[PDB]
Amino acid sequence: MGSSHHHHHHIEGREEASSMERNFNVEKINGEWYTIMLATDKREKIEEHGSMRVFVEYIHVLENSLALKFHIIINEECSEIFLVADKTEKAGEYSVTYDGSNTFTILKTDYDNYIMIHLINKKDGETFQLMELYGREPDLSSDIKEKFAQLSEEHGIVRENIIDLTNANRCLEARE
C-alpha cells in the first residue's frame, strides 16, 4: 500500500476600522429598512395571536418630522398603516399617535449596523416597554442579536422575550 498527502490555504479580506459618528447623516437612514427581531417586556403582546407585532416597512424623513409606515396581521393578511411623529420640546424624542399615546427616542443607531427604537405604549392604565430593531438586511449576524440585546436589559427586558421573527410572519412580500 501507499500514502497520499494534501495542503490547505487561508482566507483574505481583512476588514478595516471605523471612526466615531462624525459623518452622521439622516440621508443614510432615509429610505427603507427591514425587520430583524422583536423584543418587549410583554411577549404576550407580540405573540402570533396578538395585535402589537406591527413593524415598519420604510422610514421617511420630513423637514420637521419623520414619516413611517407600519403593518399588521389582519385576516391572515398584511396591512398598511400611515403615521407621523412630530418633534417635541426636546430634540431626539418623537411623539406619534397610534392606538393612544406613543413616544420614542434615538439612543443608539448605526448605518453600518442597525437602528434601535424604544417605543413605549400605554393602555388600560398599563404601560409596557417595546423595542424595535432594523438592519440593512432581513438577517443580521448572530452576534448582533446579543449586541442589541444588551440594551434590552436596560428596560428590564430579558432574552426570554427576545425572539427572532425570521421564522415568523415577515410580510416582506407585501411591502415595496
Helix or strand or coil: residue 34? coil
What is the rounded CA–CA span in Å between residue 41 and residue 131? 9
> With the C-alpha atoms ordered 83, 170, 140, 144, is the resulting torsion angle positive or negative?
positive
Is 88 within a domain? Answer: yes
What is the span of the domain harbouring residue 170?
Answer: 22-176
Number of domains the chain contains? 1
CB burial of 78-109 (b: ≥16 within 10 Å; e: otherwise) equals beeeeeebeeeeeeeebebeeeeebebbeeee
CATH of the domain at 96: 2.40.128.20
Please name the method used to determine this structure. Answer: NMR
What is the rounded CA–CA span in Å between residue 135 and residue 147? 13
What is the rounded CA–CA span in Å between residue 66 and residue 84? 6
Q: Which distant-in-sequence residues (6+ apart) come within 8 Å of 162 by Cβ? A: 37, 39, 145, 149, 152
Is 65 within a domain? Answer: yes
Which residue from 136, 154, 139, 94 is spatially nearest to 119, judged by alpha carbons? 94
All cell numbers assigned to 36 = 430583524
